[PDB]
Amino acid sequence: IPVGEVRLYQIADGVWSHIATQSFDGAVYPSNGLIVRDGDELLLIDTAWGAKNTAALLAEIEKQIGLPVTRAVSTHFHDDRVGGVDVLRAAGVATYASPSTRRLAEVEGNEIPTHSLEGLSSSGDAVRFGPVELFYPGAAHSTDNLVVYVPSASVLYGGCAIYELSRTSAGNVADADLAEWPTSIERIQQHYPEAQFVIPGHGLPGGLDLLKHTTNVVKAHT
Ligand SMILES: O=C(O)c1cccc2c1C(=O)N(c1ccccc1)C2
Ligand SMILES: [Mg+2]
Ligand SMILES: [Zn+2]
Ligand SMILES: [Zn+2]
Please answer whether residues 143 and 175 qualify as being in contact, where contact means their C-beta atoms are separated by less than 8 angstroms. yes
Phi (first) and psi of residue 20, to 5 degrees: -130, 160
- Closest to 11 (Cα-Cα) out of 163, 154, 151: 154
Would you say the C-alpha torsion 37, 186, 205, 83 has a positive or negative sign? positive
Helix (H/G/I), strand (E/B), else coil: 14: coil
Resolution to one decimal, Å: 1.9
Q: State the method.
A: X-ray
Which residue(s) pair with 69 in the sheet? 42
| 109 CA → ligand 3 middle, Å | 15
Say if residue 78 carries a ligand binding annotation.
yes
User: Binding site annotation covers 131?
Assistant: yes
**C-beta of residue 123 within 8 angstroms of C-beta of residue 187:** yes
Alpha-carbon torsion 213, 216, 221, 222, what sign?
positive
The answer to whether the annotation marks 144 as part of a ligand binding site is no
Distance CA 157, CA 148 (A): 5
69-73 and 197-200: which strand pairing?
unpaired
Short-list 59, 46, 47, 53, CA closest to 23 = 53
Q: How far apart are the first and last CA of the chain?
A: 30
Q: Is 46 a catalytic residue?
A: no
The whole-angstrom separation of Cα 148 and Cα 155 is 8
> DSSP letters of 137-174?
--SSSSTT--EEEETTTTEEEEETTS--TT--S----T
The three-class DSSP label of residue 37 is strand
Q: What is the DSSP letter of 26?
A: T
Concatenate the DSSP letters of all residues of 39-77 into one string.
TTEEEEES--SSHHHHHHHHHHHHHHT---EEEEE-SSS
Alpha carbons 7 and 15: distance in angstroms, whole number: 14
Q: What is the CATH number of the domain that holds 15?
A: 3.60.15.10
Residue 153 zone, left/alpha/beta (φ > 0; ψ -120 to 50; rest): alpha
Question: What is the Cα gyration radius of the chain?
Answer: 16
The contacts of residue 142 (CB under 8 Å, 6+ apart) are 76, 77, 78, 104, 160, 161, 175, 176
38 classed as catalytic: no
- Give the environment of ion ligand 3: residues with CB less than 5 A: 78, 160
Number of domains in the chain: 1
Q: Which residues line ligand 1 at a C-beta cut-off of 6 Å?
A: 24, 29, 78-80, 141, 160, 171-172, 202
Judge contact between 61 and 70, C-beta under 8 A: no
Domain containing 173 equals 1-222
Active-site choice (53, 78, 110, 145):
78
**CB atoms < 10 A from the CB of 7, how many?**
15
